[PDB]
Design a protein around this ligand. Structure first.
Ligand SMILES: Cc1ccc(NC(=O)NCCSCc2ccc(CN(C)C)o2)cc1Cl
Ligand SMILES: [Cl-]
Ligand SMILES: [Zn+2]
Ligand SMILES: [Zn+2]
Length: 145
């Protein structure tokens, strides 16, 4: 995740193993319950897309639900691309590129790119956008029970 230190410096840290442990244990108990969503949010403050994928990777023990979640993510990514069809290059040299859907979902962007977006002034909040997609997916599943 990205944390803000006392001088206002944004600092990246790898995801905590204790956070992953808690997430797995949560999901063991509340997998198809509405509580899984606020628990996911509670455990992903400042998360990068890479962090979120690491979290999802740890609970990949149920195809039907994870398959549903991945389908929702792909749907939301396609929708992003429809609203933001990316350009061949950035506006000028030195500028970051605008993220595609797969950049937001962390499959075609590097951690360094994610950090660059998230620590931009103001932030290009790719972790929060991805979180929204994941939450839409989790909501589908709890309805799917
Ligand atoms: C969102 C999410 C929620 C949960 C999980 N994992 C798990 O549920 N593992 C335990 C498996 S339950 C077993 C199960 C399969 C089907 C049914 C219900 N049928 C009888 C309708 O009952 C992963 C994600 Cl990604
Ligand atoms: Cl990376
Ligand atoms: Zn452009
Ligand atoms: Zn800028």
């Amino acid at each position: 995740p990205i944390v803000q230190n006392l001088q206002g410096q944004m600092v990246h840290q790898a995801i905590s193993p204790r956070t992953l442990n808690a997430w797995v244990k949560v999901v063991e108990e509340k997998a198809f319950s509405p509580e899984v969503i606020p628990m996911f949010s509670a455990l992903s403050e400042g998360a990068t897309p890479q962090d979120l994928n690491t979290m999802l990777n740890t609970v990949g023990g149920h195809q039907a639900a994870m398959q549903m979640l991945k389908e929702t993510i792909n749907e939301e990514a396609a929708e992003w691309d429809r609203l933001h069809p990316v350009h061949a290059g950035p506006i000028a040299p030195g500028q970051m590129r605008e993220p595609r859907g797969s950049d937001i979902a962390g499959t075609t962007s590097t951690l360094q790119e994610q950090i660059g977006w998230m620590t931009h002034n103001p932030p290009i909040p790719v972790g929060e956008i991805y979180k929204r997609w994941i939450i839409l997916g989790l909501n589908k599943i709890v309805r799917m029970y």
